[PDB]
Symmetry: D3
Subunit: 291 residues, 6 copies
């Protein structure tokens, strides 16, 4: 990159300024999962980007998943699962494993990566300081909605305590587990939790790292890839997408409808995808806004 003329290094940084101004002092919630979480080089770049935002006076809040890691640990423990539809039943035993993997394994890796750049990251679940509660959710299995154990949606968020934590300069690394109104901890889909945290905290942007270039209207058609879309159009479009895109898309709608100015589905396989999406116009993601 040193064969690059210095006058063009200058212009790339200069073109970041319109977005430094837009995001100064603001909350950006990032859903982090996928190849950006499993590959070492993408990992270290993601953590450096959180340090970047932080050293610009931007306020990142990281919400992370970890589905495949939970599965692996359940297999290592010989815990036989029950499956309704394509869904595993979250028994009390499965939750304990989920919680212990999400918070005591996956969240730890990111906290330590980020913290290589300074005392920024702090891990939390909705259990800590009663930061958020959960409400048990049911699922639709081929027509009928059904119960699959201690799985839920974010219920209420302690908006005030969360933003105190962020104003104190900390990067909250969130593992999506929270107690219900009776104190029974549920596991929450990390995508939908990111959308709820973003809306609760008045985030300026929601970033959803995904293992795809962006939203395709008519996948596989390469020409069908869109760069920006409104909630109304995207809602009518949603019952048409690959099984894996539904949660990422539903998050963007819930968030953007809920007042978050924009939600972005960006390519987590691109090194420093966060910096390219936020500080560059050459991003590959797709931006969702209200309409």
């Amino acid at each position: 990159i040193e064969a690059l003329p210095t006058h063009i290094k200058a212009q790339v940084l200069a073109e970041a300024l319109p977005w430094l101004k837009q995001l100064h002092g603001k909350v950006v919630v990032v859903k982090y999962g996928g190849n950006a979480m499993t590959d070492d080089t993408l990992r270290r770049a993601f953590a450096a980007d959180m340090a970047f935002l932080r050293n610009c006076g931007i306020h990142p809040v990281v919400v992370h998943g970890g589905g495949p890691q939970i599965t692996a640990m359940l297999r290592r423990l010989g815990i036989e699962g029950d499956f309704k539809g394509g869904f595993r039943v979250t028994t009390p035993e499965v939750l304990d494993v989920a919680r212990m993997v999400l918070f005591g394994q996956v969240g730890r890796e990111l906290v330590n990566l980020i913290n290589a750049h300074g005392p920024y990251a702090v891990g939390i679940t909705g259990e800590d300081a009663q930061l958020f509660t959960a409400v048990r959710r049911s699922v639709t299995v081929d027509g009928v909605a059904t119960d699959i154990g201690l799985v839920g949606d974010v219920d209420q968020v302690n908006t005030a305590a969360m933003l105190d934590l962020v104003a104190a300069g900390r990067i909250p690394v969130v593992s999506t587990l929270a107690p219900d109104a009776d104190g029974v901890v549920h596991n929450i889909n990390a995508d939908t939790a990111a959308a709820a945290v973003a809306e609760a905290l008045g985030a300026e942007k929601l970033l959803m790292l995904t293992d795809i270039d962006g939203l395709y209207t008519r996948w596989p058609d390469r020409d069908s890839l869109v760069s920006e879309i409104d909630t109304g159009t995207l809602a009518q479009l949603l019952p048409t997408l690959e099984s894996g895109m539904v949660p990422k898309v539903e998050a963007c709608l819930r968030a953007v409808i809920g007042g978050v100015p924009s939600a972005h589905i960006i390519d987590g396989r691109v090194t420093h995808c966060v910096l390219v999406e936020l500080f560059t116009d050459a991003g590959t993601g797709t931006k969702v806004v209200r309409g």
Copy 2:
């Protein structure tokens, strides 16, 4: 307890006042382990006592162990251990399990118990916000000191950030894991970590919950049980005690020598042992002070 005359209910509470004054606004560090951690009734009482202190404007900091739980999980995972002397070697794999059990299992139970009384508890390790570092320790096996993996002592403590967390009204629940100066996370003996946190934070008292009535000079002699002792006497006495008492005792010396006004070894099998030790003169523990 209602057959108890009201005029004596009155006097018991009145006699708590000399200790409410002594402890008002102050930090009390509690090592929590043993039967007080495994039994349901003692569990709920311990958490209620932390809520009590907190609702008196006293500042508890909880440091917890969990040795037997780590062993069990290693056995459930089929992870064969190596043993030098009576010590298990903490490989990278054993640390990941320890960290995931301490922080993602044991600490969670206490956070949720305490938090049944309000938004108080918050879990943390030395990894979060760089709260404390670790230095690799060696051990003495029948004469010679040896290496047993990623096990260490608390190195430095972020005293300022810790007391901000406490002034914000939070009860820090600490899992004893922290990175070394190179970012490699070590597991720390929970007893010695409690002594280091107490001294770093200028605690007024160190409470060490133990499965015994108190320190015996000449165990089994029931008459040999002492109520208070100075560091000088207790140091010359230390090479004489049951294997299990050494860590609890070494903690009290390191702390009290380090300026903590008193450290107490109290009976964790007594319901509300924290309240009896702090707000009553009828305690069963033994108090260590400087001399």
Copy 3:
């Protein structure tokens, strides 16, 4: 009290916690008079209880009477009184004596008692920092309302300045004298002033120390003693009580109707009646709530 098993000392303190939580950070106004003011042992216990509340992060505000002491001083001064009905006329001369006895004698004893436990108590009248004003009141003498000099009801309260004084950690000891809108100081019935301070400051509880076990519906019938009653019932009941109970009762109605969650008439002849009423369910008082 040492013959009392330690496990029951433990449970008495544990049962205080539901009320420590309820009252944490809150204002409790206490009317203090009667035998609790004249007997040495009750005196010292009352002051220790104010220190207790304070060392729990509860905010006591003490309003005191002193009728019999004013009478005595007037007799020592040879000041002949005029009496309309059963009421002494408060001339300018009688007010000066009242003010000087209430603020310069009675309030001083309590300030010095409380302050034996720390720098808490501070004496004040509505004159200081313009904390509250008075409005001249008339009285009903056998049918007709009449003028009995410079006696009044609390008019307006400097709510903000009062709670600053309390947030600064001080226990306000209030002598019920205040200027009217023209600067002429009036004496205020201490019971009704306690009710006005409690309502103005958003107190959580009003405690009225009285020389009786509690409110009797049909005094002398011992069985007629009630433990809790609503304002509607008690209002229809009020024109039936002993002459001395009317002021204590009228205070509870004015306060509870005014939004104070509960007002209590408690036995001031019981040592530490404040602690038993607030931190115990075995209290002898009667609780008034809205309805």
Copy 4:
């Protein structure tokens, strides 16, 4: 005063500015007694001057006496005094009367006068919030020092709490009574207490209102009246003055030696003597400074 040309009204106020700057933000302690306390017109002017200072962002602290008023009340109460030398013995009974007269009578008049201009004045004794303690003093009766009861000198001052009270915008009206180290309240000479408060609070000036034009070297010689004098000269001069001037002079030395930049003995029979001494060069007082 309206026959006075407007251009000279202008210049008088303009010439106040060098002293407005000198005193801005600073503490001025005023001993108030004598004819300035007993005459109605001087009274109202003194209180207006305290309001003046306050509305300039200057911080007055008023310390008041009241000897003759105590005597009168003792006579009205038929309390026979004991006299060693020319000194009355302060029995427990005499103290109660002194305290009740100073704090519940004399201090009240000034609080209400000052407070006619706003919520400024607040009465206090060393008893309140433990603001200051007293140490029992003995006296010299024709050669030998002797005990005359509960009379003392200011021992320690809660400098911090006092200046918080002043930074909150309040004019402390101080009655000179305070507890000793055992809680027994003593009465303190108001002149010497003013000197101790001034020095403790880092006052810029000490004003001592007196019923005289100023210090005379060789009273009655009218020419012997001095305008300024150093502590060294005045100390060698002190054993030569009228009985009444000794306390006012000893106060100025203790204060000025103690670091107060200047202490002034000013004519309390001059209306608005405070304003003329502070904001004018035409003052009649005598200024004491270090040397």
Copy 5:
């Protein structure tokens, strides 16, 4: 002034107190121009008066003109003017000169004068910290409104940032230049700008220094000079006054109608006219209030 008896120096200062109370903590905006700006003795007195206000905890904000100085500099620069009606066209070149004279010459003199008394004065234009914007204004030339270049009225004021600057203790010296919504700086009539700043900042008073004794109803009739007048009367009166009085009068109406309690037209040729108008009843100015 020393031949003046001290008891009358006392009374002049005492009579300032009703206005010290009225103005304590408040904003007073002063338009400064005319002979009070050009004469050395009036200059130094004006600056001392701003220091006076400041050392009373009053908040002056100074808005200054400088028309004749701009003319002179344009003549020294040989810049030929264009005149529509009696108005000079403010070309880009004339603005640069105006800005450079107002801010870099006239404002500097006052900042340095005021600052001889302390670190108070600070110069600013609407350009600094975006304190205020301008909107291009047109003028009426014998019937028709016309364009005379980059001249405008104050558009919006950064009320918050301005009062932060004043709460920090600074005396803002304002040169009336500000950018329009496109960033093009305009020059603003200093009289109308004073009226807009006073209203924006919630000023208690607007002072307009003028080279006249006050408003005359029927100039030259000496008897026609009025001391106070309401906005309704003065508005119907405005189309009758000397050309020079219109701007000063229009300012007072815009301000007083806009909620400023009073605006004063005072004689800037009187030394310390600010002190006589604010702290004396003998002022020569005329007070405008709402009606």
Copy 6:
């Protein structure tokens, strides 16, 4: 710049992070003059860079020159100069012109440029709020030191008030004029003033924009251009450089010796030279550090 692959736009921004961390929360003083001040494109880029720093939570302080502009205005005014050596004598008349050009012309352009990005820039001289004083300096003319009027060096800096201004979020644009100890304003060489402000405010870096690539040891030898040098080496080197480099170099020594970690001489003819020097390793400047 869009033909540039997105993965290299990503890496350029990522490589800025080590310097974002180094400079976070810190003061950077920039001397601004030369072609970077006169050319429109460099102008707008410099102001955007100050906005950049500011939107990263870095604290720029801009010190500007303007020598050639003063000369031009003196010529436009027909003010004949006196010259001792190669130095113009700064008469009172020349200072007024300098001050009016520096503060009322040159500083205004930069304030308005910067402020196009937000309410950041604020102009000031040492006159405002007494921010800094000047001490008259003499100069060396062919051997002998001589007087050339009201020209000086920065004497003392109000470090506290300056950093309050910066903590409030403002970019101070400094025109180098300040009063001496008698209030007579002097003009200060802008290079030496930048060095004094940087050292006074504890700046992390001093940037000196210059119309050259960097320091040449043996100019014209292109190979003699150095990238970094210590103060000791550079001091022995100083009496060898082109007349124009002496002031820029003397500034770097005074600053770096005074504790500023590094001072940089950077090419002001390079667009966004500030961003390339601070956030890139490809800079053309030369870095001075202590040794």
